[PDB]
Design a protein around this motif. Structure first.
Motif, PDB file in Angstrom:
ATOM      1  N   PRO A 299       0.855  -1.308  -0.089  1.00  0.00           N
ATOM      2  CA  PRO A 299       0.122  -0.028  -0.173  1.00  0.00           C
ATOM      3  C   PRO A 299       0.950   1.303  -0.037  1.00  0.00           C
ATOM      4  CG  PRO A 299      -1.064  -1.638   1.385  1.00  0.00           C
ATOM      5  CD  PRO A 299       0.436  -2.148   1.036  1.00  0.00           C
TER       6      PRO A 299
ATOM      7  N   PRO B 233       0.541   5.948  -0.345  1.00  0.00           N
ATOM      8  CA  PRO B 233      -0.020   7.281  -0.463  1.00  0.00           C
ATOM      9  C   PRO B 233      -0.312   7.354  -1.737  1.00  0.00           C
ATOM     10  CG  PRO B 233       1.783   7.434   0.757  1.00  0.00           C
ATOM     11  CD  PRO B 233       2.157   6.034  -0.134  1.00  0.00           C
TER      12      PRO B 233
ATOM     13  N   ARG C  59      -8.958   5.967   3.010  1.00  0.00           N
ATOM     14  CA  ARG C  59      -8.290   7.365   3.806  1.00  0.00           C
ATOM     15  C   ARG C  59      -6.852   7.764   3.177  1.00  0.00           C
ATOM     16  NH1 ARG C  59      -6.808   4.373   8.023  1.00  0.00           N
ATOM     17  NH2 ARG C  59      -8.001   2.476   7.547  1.00  0.00           N
TER      18      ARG C  59
ATOM     19  N   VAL D  79      -4.764   6.221   1.354  1.00  0.00           N
ATOM     20  CA  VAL D  79      -3.821   5.261   0.963  1.00  0.00           C
ATOM     21  C   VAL D  79      -4.322   4.297  -0.098  1.00  0.00           C
ATOM     22  CG1 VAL D  79      -2.366   3.308   1.900  1.00  0.00           C
ATOM     23  CG2 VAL D  79      -2.865   5.412   3.363  1.00  0.00           C
TER      24      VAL D  79
ATOM     25  N   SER E  40     -11.452  15.216   3.199  1.00  0.00           N
ATOM     26  CA  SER E  40     -10.415  15.902   3.831  1.00  0.00           C
ATOM     27  C   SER E  40     -10.004  15.411   5.225  1.00  0.00           C
ATOM     28  CB  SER E  40     -10.552  17.215   3.786  1.00  0.00           C
ATOM     29  OG  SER E  40     -11.891  17.418   4.254  1.00  0.00           O
ATOM     30  N   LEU E  41     -10.746  14.495   5.649  1.00  0.00           N
ATOM     31  CA  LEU E  41     -10.720  13.694   6.987  1.00  0.00           C
ATOM     32  C   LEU E  41     -10.751  14.859   8.133  1.00  0.00           C
ATOM     33  CD1 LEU E  41      -8.380  10.984   5.751  1.00  0.00           C
ATOM     34  CD2 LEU E  41     -10.756  10.982   5.795  1.00  0.00           C
ATOM     35  N   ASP E  42     -11.066  15.991   8.098  1.00  0.00           N
ATOM     36  CA  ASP E  42     -11.061  16.936   9.135  1.00  0.00           C
ATOM     37  C   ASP E  42     -12.308  17.229   9.668  1.00  0.00           C
ATOM     38  OD1 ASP E  42     -12.281  17.987   7.008  1.00  0.00           O
ATOM     39  OD2 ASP E  42     -10.576  19.695   6.719  1.00  0.00           O
TER      40      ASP E  42
ATOM     41  N   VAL F  97     -15.646  27.169   8.822  1.00  0.00           N
ATOM     42  CA  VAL F  97     -15.825  26.731  10.408  1.00  0.00           C
ATOM     43  C   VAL F  97     -15.264  27.609  11.184  1.00  0.00           C
ATOM     44  CG1 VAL F  97     -15.680  24.854  12.075  1.00  0.00           C
ATOM     45  CG2 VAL F  97     -16.367  24.157   9.777  1.00  0.00           C
TER      46      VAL F  97
ATOM     47  N   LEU G 137     -15.433  16.365  18.466  1.00  0.00           N
ATOM     48  CA  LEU G 137     -15.655  15.160  17.377  1.00  0.00           C
ATOM     49  C   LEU G 137     -16.405  13.926  18.392  1.00  0.00           C
ATOM     50  CD1 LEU G 137     -14.322  16.323  15.114  1.00  0.00           C
ATOM     51  CD2 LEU G 137     -12.266  15.286  15.813  1.00  0.00           C
ATOM     52  N   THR G 138     -16.916  14.163  19.418  1.00  0.00           N
ATOM     53  CA  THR G 138     -17.657  13.335  20.249  1.00  0.00           C
ATOM     54  C   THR G 138     -18.889  12.739  19.690  1.00  0.00           C
ATOM     55  OG1 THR G 138     -18.308  15.190  21.706  1.00  0.00           O
ATOM     56  CG2 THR G 138     -16.172  13.790  22.468  1.00  0.00           C
TER      57      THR G 138
ATOM     58  N   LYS H 156     -18.789  10.322  14.482  1.00  0.00           N
ATOM     59  CA  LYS H 156     -18.193   9.239  14.504  1.00  0.00           C
ATOM     60  C   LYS H 156     -18.440   8.246  13.502  1.00  0.00           C
ATOM     61  CE  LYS H 156     -17.311   9.644  19.558  1.00  0.00           C
ATOM     62  NZ  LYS H 156     -15.793   9.439  19.733  1.00  0.00           N
TER      63      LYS H 156
ATOM     64  N   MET I  43     -17.258   9.549  10.175  1.00  0.00           N
ATOM     65  CA  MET I  43     -15.649   9.259  10.310  1.00  0.00           C
ATOM     66  C   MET I  43     -15.432   7.832   9.847  1.00  0.00           C
ATOM     67  SD  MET I  43     -14.398  11.436  13.921  1.00  0.00           S
ATOM     68  CE  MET I  43     -12.789  10.632  13.541  1.00  0.00           C
TER      69      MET I  43
ATOM     70  N   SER J 177     -13.631   5.118   5.973  1.00  0.00           N
ATOM     71  CA  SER J 177     -12.898   3.950   5.736  1.00  0.00           C
ATOM     72  C   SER J 177     -13.197   3.171   4.469  1.00  0.00           C
ATOM     73  CB  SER J 177     -12.708   3.036   6.800  1.00  0.00           C
ATOM     74  OG  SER J 177     -11.981   3.811   7.857  1.00  0.00           O
TER      75      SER J 177
ATOM     76  N   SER K 236      -3.230  20.410   8.934  1.00  0.00           N
ATOM     77  CA  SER K 236      -4.005  19.613   8.099  1.00  0.00           C
ATOM     78  C   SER K 236      -5.565  19.417   8.817  1.00  0.00           C
ATOM     79  CB  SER K 236      -3.546  18.432   7.474  1.00  0.00           C
ATOM     80  OG  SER K 236      -2.759  17.873   8.523  1.00  0.00           O
ATOM     81  N   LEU K 237      -5.348  19.602  10.232  1.00  0.00           N
ATOM     82  CA  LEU K 237      -6.441  19.395  11.182  1.00  0.00           C
ATOM     83  C   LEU K 237      -7.187  17.966  10.969  1.00  0.00           C
ATOM     84  CD1 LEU K 237      -7.916  22.930  10.259  1.00  0.00           C
ATOM     85  CD2 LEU K 237      -6.237  22.283  11.977  1.00  0.00           C
ATOM     86  N   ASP K 238      -6.257  16.938  10.679  1.00  0.00           N
ATOM     87  CA  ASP K 238      -6.997  15.822  10.425  1.00  0.00           C
ATOM     88  C   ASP K 238      -6.203  14.571  11.238  1.00  0.00           C
ATOM     89  OD1 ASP K 238      -4.426  15.980   9.301  1.00  0.00           O
ATOM     90  OD2 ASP K 238      -4.863  14.911   7.246  1.00  0.00           O
TER      91      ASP K 238
ATOM     92  N   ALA L 260       2.723   8.256   5.934  1.00  0.00           N
ATOM     93  CA  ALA L 260       1.449   7.459   5.605  1.00  0.00           C
ATOM     94  C   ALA L 260       0.851   6.785   6.898  1.00  0.00           C
ATOM     95  CB  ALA L 260       1.780   6.441   4.503  1.00  0.00           C
TER      96      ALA L 260
ATOM     97  N   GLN M 191      -1.616   3.866   7.982  1.00  0.00           N
ATOM     98  CA  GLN M 191      -2.155   2.575   7.272  1.00  0.00           C
ATOM     99  C   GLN M 191      -3.147   2.085   8.272  1.00  0.00           C
ATOM    100  OE1 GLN M 191       1.688   0.852   5.548  1.00  0.00           O
ATOM    101  NE2 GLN M 191      -0.320   0.074   4.352  1.00  0.00           N
TER     102      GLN M 191
ATOM    103  N   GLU N 227      -6.106   1.700  11.385  1.00  0.00           N
ATOM    104  CA  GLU N 227      -7.245   2.506  11.619  1.00  0.00           C
ATOM    105  C   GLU N 227      -6.887   3.611  12.902  1.00  0.00           C
ATOM    106  OE1 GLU N 227     -10.724   2.585  10.917  1.00  0.00           O
ATOM    107  OE2 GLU N 227     -10.288   1.712   9.213  1.00  0.00           O
TER     108      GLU N 227
END
Ligand SMILES: [NH3+]Cc1ccc(F)c(Oc2ccccc2)c1F
Ligand SMILES: [NH3+]Cc1ccc(F)c(Oc2ccccc2)c1F
Lengths: 642, 645
Positions: A140, A142, A172, A174, A450-452, A616, A622-623, A628, A631, A635, B453-455, B618, B620, B622
């Motif tokens: 795997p 990026p 995510r 990858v 963006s996972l943010d 924002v 994020l609770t 969640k 989020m 995946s 990046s806030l991630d 990276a 990988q 979770e």
């Protein structure tokens, strides 16, 4: 611009190395001339446009690459631009006859499951074949590492070509697997006829069929052909994205063809019992899709259109029509995927310069070009419309602004006027003009994963595609002489839409059409699986998963977001629902969040952010379990182009 | 390449301030005008829209000078009617450069009255109200994403009369939202106009009566590290000489005893010697490990190779600048051949020849003829170790004496003496002091950059970038020493010199914590001295941010930290800290990359999602975001962050 060879990857076990043959200036001059004298060598080329670099692979005497990189562009060649011999938008595959000197790889047929992907850095990456068009990376990486490698070969150990790389499959960010165009798809494409003639309406078949009709505006795709079918005794539904065009078809038809058709829109319905019905895609969806035994023929007009109502409408037709007893679905457009804007007889095209009293997108408009007559000026935003209209009015020119939210009555319809409009004009008003002036840009929405914490919907201004350019220009030169003035001569490739539009489809299913996410998926799958339509990355399972978790929305907030008419009423309302219930403030106090205003004194704390639909400003937590859940949805396997 | 004018922003002449733009050049036009540096288009308007190959931004003529930002323009010339116009002002510290405007060009003029109501002009021709809140700072009335401000650096802040207060250089951001703006005051410009255009720092300064910091810009071989400390010693002064390299430090020490008849103190990890001489040679690392300046020990501290932007050097120099006066020193000399703003110019001993596609040896998209490297001693710079290994492997295959050198390997694997092709990374310049018959340069470098990046927090990304003028000069300097030399290159590069990334500041806090027993507060005092001292490499001021982060990273596992220190990879503190939180949660590391090798033995007992603190590569596995340290760093992200526009 043309696509241009800027380097090569030399292949030898498999090893590779790269050669750069052109720098920036060379690339740019060669793109504009279409004239490339450089001798081509090898089977893998490094290619570039103005915006992007990727790879191309010669097999069976054809230099192949991806539609998403090359679009419908010509390839700069020893004698000038080479037009594509093959264009398959569904397979993300285009090809030019290989220029002299180029070698081809030979297709792999024995078929090993050990594969090797050659990237633009001349790395050779082991890949384990998993299907016809799919392979897993042993290590795997990026996705960033695979970008620029679209069009490169997947080789079996003997160095024969299995296919060309088109997309990464990602968890995510990858890449765990790669999608490729198999050589068999190239063979099928080579064996298809270059010119297939779709300009004439098909006869009704004995059993169900989906057909394409490619014909210009004013060819009577929406009037003359439905009339002809009714005359043969069939019942026919005609779907169109525009309320104004739908209503207009009815007056034209009772005049020009002696039929008083049914008319269905949100604003007005007329049922005459006639055998022809005109409806908007939106009203058709509101009415619950196909009713059994109602129609023999369904014509989906302007089937190039990539707004979410049309896509969802068309998918519904494609999913339901056979079962509802229809024998024919006709997918109708003047600008199908892969089409390009070409000269029109009725229309003189003239570039804007810097001379003129009126500034416009870095160029200028002479007051003399618009002082008298009826003229249309396309701007990208309503802010620009408002200001340019105010300027023209200040100079004594009769000018008016039109965009989403205004009533079309702001017109006039008769007499001298300059209309300054966004693309909302296309669907709000059916008339033509003496001239069209075009900024050549469009506002669009794109998803960023963006996972943010989750995803972001970004609003950007982009260069127009060939559908936009053709539809904007087509507002002049209709059965009379016209002029098209423009800021920029380019056009992006047509027929592709962003994953955000899929999100908009789920949103609208939930907000307006009472569709479960699962039901939206069935209808979109039918669209995606049907060839010849606009294309997109397959993110259906992802978006379904997201909306599936958005339960027990507050009806009041939803009614208010629907009513205010902004873009993702369901996501907006749902975020507002979780804010209220968590007794917490919205991401900001922008207009988007106005439905929470009366609770503003009793807010407080960090926002439980689900996703980002704008800036924002407040603190975030994020609770919340919906956060969640979303989020966790990130995946999922996500197709991303390389 | 020159900077070229591609458009202009026209301001309203009366009533409210409004604006619109005019585009004067397309892409091809820009690229061609960049190459020739010749631009015949006349220069209307006072705000120009300017571009390089890589970016676009603004420039504002004030008082006959077309001003813009150093971070956009570097030291580049401006395309002009008679050819390239050389900069007349280059102030790296203020992020301000100026070219004399063509005769007849229009120019704004300064804000005479003094309003607190300001209006920023953007490249989009919007006029954005700003509330002045200091000499060089102002609040946005309506906060905006910083993306909306990018490409606007160099544009004017105007007062209500349409007179210039200053030029835009950076936004102050909270999690990607610009709430305020930084600009170069028009007063910082009017100085420069009145002052001398040229400076000479080619001679070592005289020892002053009271403490001063001075610059010495002079070539390698002028004896910055030997001749000038010896000359100072000969006048009765005690001199400390700091250098980034052990090998250079030991080399100077040895040369001094053989040539200039002094047996100096030597202070390094591998070799420490006290002779009581009045000259001392030390590396910056040993000097830091020694605890910095000891009272009354030196009159003069020479900070040599002061262009270096490795974290040890920065922290070393910062310590000298904070401690030296109070420790009794009279003079700090900041010494380099390649100061900020410098540009590579021709060297007489060195013939420079572009590689082509002709040659047997593939090299970064071009090719090296075997004949160029068979006869003699030769140095090939590659950006990575992999490439060094793959190239050496190939060269020996073709029957050449080729050895690889990079971090982790021992020098002297380089023949002395012999006859050789050495294929190396930049680690060469600190591990080995010799020179060569030719140098072959890939013209690219591996670097690290921070993305906020806030991630959930930040990311340190490793990238390959074009070389800067310091890199080019230093790589080219390994040939043509005292004799004839040949420099072969893939690209005629040079990004601008003298700027470093915020990740380097991160590295300084990490090194303070890992190596030098510095609290983050203490690291901040030293870094502050470096940033506040002019004429050094420059960076965005993220000191408070980085201090806040490291302050919360307590109770690290000492064992993991000792393994990351010893392994020699970047960010030993942050790597060991992430490993610490993983091991204590019995969780796996973000991946099983070699970065995480301290955790390999534990893999059988590590289960579930990794509690992710930040991204160093990276990821990988979770991830979970519930760790209290994750939350603490998340809260640190609310800090005001300077971001260039
Ligand atoms: N797998 C279906 C498919 C087909 C053709 C494409 F060009 C394509 O690529 C894109 C890329 C971005 C947006 C839309 C389509 C694609 F995914
Ligand atoms: N305020 C100090 C300062 C000075 C000069 C700069 F060019 C600059 O801009 C950058 C930009 C990116 C990296 C490093 C420095 C800067 F911040």
């Amino acid at each position: 611009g043309s696509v241009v060879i800027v380097g090569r990857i030399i292949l030898s076990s498999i090893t590779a190395y790269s050669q750069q043959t052109r720098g920036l200036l060379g690339c740019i001059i060669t793109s504009l001339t279409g004239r490339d004298k450089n001798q081509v060598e090898g089977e893998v080329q490094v290619v570039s446009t103005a915006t992007q670099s990727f790879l191309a692979t010669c097999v069976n005497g054809v230099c192949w690459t991806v539609y998403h990189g090359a679009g419908s562009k010509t390839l700069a060649g020893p004698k000038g631009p080479i037009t594509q011999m093959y264009t398959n938008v569904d397979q993300d595959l285009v090809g030019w006859q290989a220029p002299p000197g180029a070698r081809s790889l030979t297709p792999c047929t024995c078929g090993s499951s050990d594969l090797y992907l050659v990237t633009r850095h001349a790395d050779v990456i082991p890949v384990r074949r998993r299907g016809d068009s799919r392979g897993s990376l042993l290590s795997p990486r990026p996705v960033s590492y695979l970008k620029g490698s679209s069009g490169g070969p997947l080789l079996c150990p003997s160095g024969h070509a299995v296919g060309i790389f088109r997309a990464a499959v990602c968890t995510r960010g990858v890449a765990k697997a790669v999608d490729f165009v198999p050589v068999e798809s190239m063979e099928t494409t080579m064996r298809s006829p270059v010119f297939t003639d779709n300009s004439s309406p098909p006869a009704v078949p004995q059993s169900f069929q989906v057909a394409h009709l490619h014909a210009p505006t004013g060819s009577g795709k929406s009037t003359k052909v439905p009339a002809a079918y009714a005359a043969q005794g069939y019942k026919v539904l005609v779907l169109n994205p525009s309320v104004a065009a739908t209503l207009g078809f009815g007056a034209y038809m009772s005049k020009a063809h002696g039929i008083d058709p049914n008319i269905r829109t949100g604003v007005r319905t007329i049922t005459t019992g006639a055998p022809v019905t005109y409806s908007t895609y939106g009203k058709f969806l509101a009415d619950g899709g196909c009713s059994g035994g109602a129609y023999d023929i369904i014509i989906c007009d302007e089937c190039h259109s990539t707004d979410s109502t049309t896509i969802l409408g068309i998918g519904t037709v494609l999913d339901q029509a056979e079962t509802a007893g229809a024998r024919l679905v006709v997918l109708a457009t003047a600008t199908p995927p892969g089409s390009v804007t070409v000269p029109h007889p009725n229309i003189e095209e003239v570039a804007l310069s810097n001379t003129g009293e009126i500034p416009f997108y870095g160029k200028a408009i002479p007051i003399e070009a618009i002082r008298g007559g009826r003229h249309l000026i396309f701007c990208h935003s309503k802010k620009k419309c408002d200001e340019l209209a105010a300027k023209l009015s200040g100079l004594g020119i009769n000018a008016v602004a039109y965009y989403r939210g205004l009533d079309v009555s702001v017109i006039p319809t008769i007499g001298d006027v300059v209309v300054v409009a966004t693309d909302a004009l296309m669907t709000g008003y059916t008339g033509d003009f003496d001239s069209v002036i075009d900024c050549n840009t469009c506002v669009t929405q794109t998803v960023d994963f963006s996972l943010d914490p989750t995803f972001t919907i970004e609003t950007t201004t982009v260069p127009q595609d060939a559908v936009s350019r053709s539809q904007r220009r087509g507002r002049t030169g209709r059965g009379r002489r016209g002029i098209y003035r423009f800021v920029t001569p380019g056009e992006r490739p047509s027929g592709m839409f962003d994953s955000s539009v899929l999100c908009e489809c789920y949103d609208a299913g939930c907000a307006w059409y009472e569709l479960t996410p699962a039901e939206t998926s069935v209808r979109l799958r039918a669209y995606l699986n049907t060839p010849g339509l606009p294309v997109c990355q397959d993110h259906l399972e992802f978006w379904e998963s997201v909306f599936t978790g958005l339960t027990h929305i507050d009806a009041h907030f939803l009614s208010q977001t629907k009513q205010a008419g902004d873009n993702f009423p369901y996501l907006v309302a749902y975020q507002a629902t979780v804010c209220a219930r968590a007794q917490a403030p919205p991401p900001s106090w922008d207009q988007m969040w106005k439905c929470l205003i009366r609770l503003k004194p009793t807010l407080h704390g960090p926002t439980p952010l689900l996703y980002r639909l704008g800036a924002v400003q407040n603190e975030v937590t994020l609770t919340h379990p919906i956060t969640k859940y979303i989020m966790a949805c990130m995946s999922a396997d996500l197709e991303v182009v390389t």
